[PDB]
Fold this protein.
Amino acid sequence: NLCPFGEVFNATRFASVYAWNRKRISNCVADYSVLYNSASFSTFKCYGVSPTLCFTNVYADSFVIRGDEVRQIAPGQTGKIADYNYKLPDDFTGCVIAWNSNNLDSKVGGNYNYLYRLFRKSNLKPFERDISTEIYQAGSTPCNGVEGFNCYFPLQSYGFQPTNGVGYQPYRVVVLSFETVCGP
Amino acid sequence: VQLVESGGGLIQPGGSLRLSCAASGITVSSNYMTWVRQPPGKGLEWVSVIYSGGSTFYADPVKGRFTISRDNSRNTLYLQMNSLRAEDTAVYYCARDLQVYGMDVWGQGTTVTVSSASTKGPSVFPLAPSGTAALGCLVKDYFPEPVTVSWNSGALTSGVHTFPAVLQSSGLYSLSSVVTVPSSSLGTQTYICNVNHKPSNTKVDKKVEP
Amino acid sequence: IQLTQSPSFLSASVGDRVTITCRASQGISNFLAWYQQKPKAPKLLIYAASTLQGGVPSTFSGSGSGTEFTLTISSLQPEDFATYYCQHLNDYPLFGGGTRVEIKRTVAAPSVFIFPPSDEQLKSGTASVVCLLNNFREAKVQWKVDNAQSGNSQESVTEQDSKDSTYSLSSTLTLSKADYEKHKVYACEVTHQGLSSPVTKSFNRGE
Ligand SMILES: *[C@@H]1O[C@H](CO)[C@@H](O)[C@H](O)[C@H]1NC(C)=O
């Protein structure tokens, strides 16, 4: 039975990096050539493996980030997305694939539905997802649920706009992590 | 509430200085903390940022020479500047960057001067006259910057233009102080410029006469 | 990636409307901030292009999304006279060149004075010739030696006067005593709007 990669890649709606989606691909056969030979990808970075196997489980994590932020979807990277949104491990065996989504995820006036965490006290551990909407305490006084000075909402929108520069344009990113699944 | 900067001074090319930003009303660890510099007469430039999680980013000019640091116990942010160069001469500002909400809290500033020059007091020469008349003193060949020029021990305050100082190839500063006076008074009134350069303990009183 | 603040210098009077424009090379949406610096620490006025920071007067407004952004002061007030900077809100923060808002006044022609090198300095071996332009902002000084000068000149401009709202400029021509002794006529030619024709003040060495 073929692996359901189309569902992840051709999904109508992707998710915010803060709440990235994970699809477990198990008990299936997969041709990775079709994906590589699509030619629709800006980034096809594979770490620990060549273009060419067999793995216990395959995970397909998917989200939307800016183009200037795809660099952070790699092992050993630092930044707001890597540190506080999605982290790839230093020991990473897998492939990171990406494409521009301006036509789909950008709206005149801006798309305020894709959010990110700008505020977190600590860097995220690998493959951790924080979906907390708690108000951040940037100072001594406890925030107590009220936004204000030193009391701020941790999640912010990208406001993707079609006139945005490509680096600030939305990119759809699928991370294939290799941990039932074999090539043809 | 307040961000207080300290540590600025005079240093020579290749030297090292550490600047401190002491915070009240914000937590340095809980916030994105930034260093911004204003080269003299040139406007604002970013240098570095420490993130809440420890991630440090630096501007390409200061990349292998500067390190941003924090002490949560003292609520203090630091910039260690090493391999300093003349181009690193500026007023260094510390700020809290709420990234999408702007850099709201800023510090007063600390001045860093990097020069190969040595403290020298001013050589004061007369700028002398030939309607209205102009007479002046040239304060020349001095380092470091603070210079004060007064006329008639503070009694001549009108028509006085003490000009901003310029930096010469020598590495030394020169300024001019001028006063416009009635042509008639030139033979009736004494005009003495009183110049102080506290760095060399040089006080000079020079009489300008036609 | 490139931010250009267009009116580097602006002249206006209290109650006037002042518009400052910041242009980005590429679309940055609403990611811009506006700051004011009096000669002392920049102050944040506007974040997200249109949002006022608390306490900032309503006379202050932000507009723009994408490539072109503008800061507008509805009625300039005495304390609003200062320098204004646009910042791009990005992981790599960028600031604009800056805009200085200055008090407008009627055109005042400069008073031009030339001061010859002091005999005391000439003993040292350097000659400094000084030209004063008093109570005039755009002015041009041309040093001419024997009707001929570039690269031996430096100049300074005073900040606007509290009472006359005018500017003063000083220029120094630095020459070796030996070079000074190789020419006779030393002049300062000044071009300003108030001057209908350029004014030259000259001295002949040794009179
Ligand atoms: C998505 O749709 C295209 C339609 O031609 C198809 O070729 C592709 O296999 C689908 N899935 C993937 C993996 O992109």
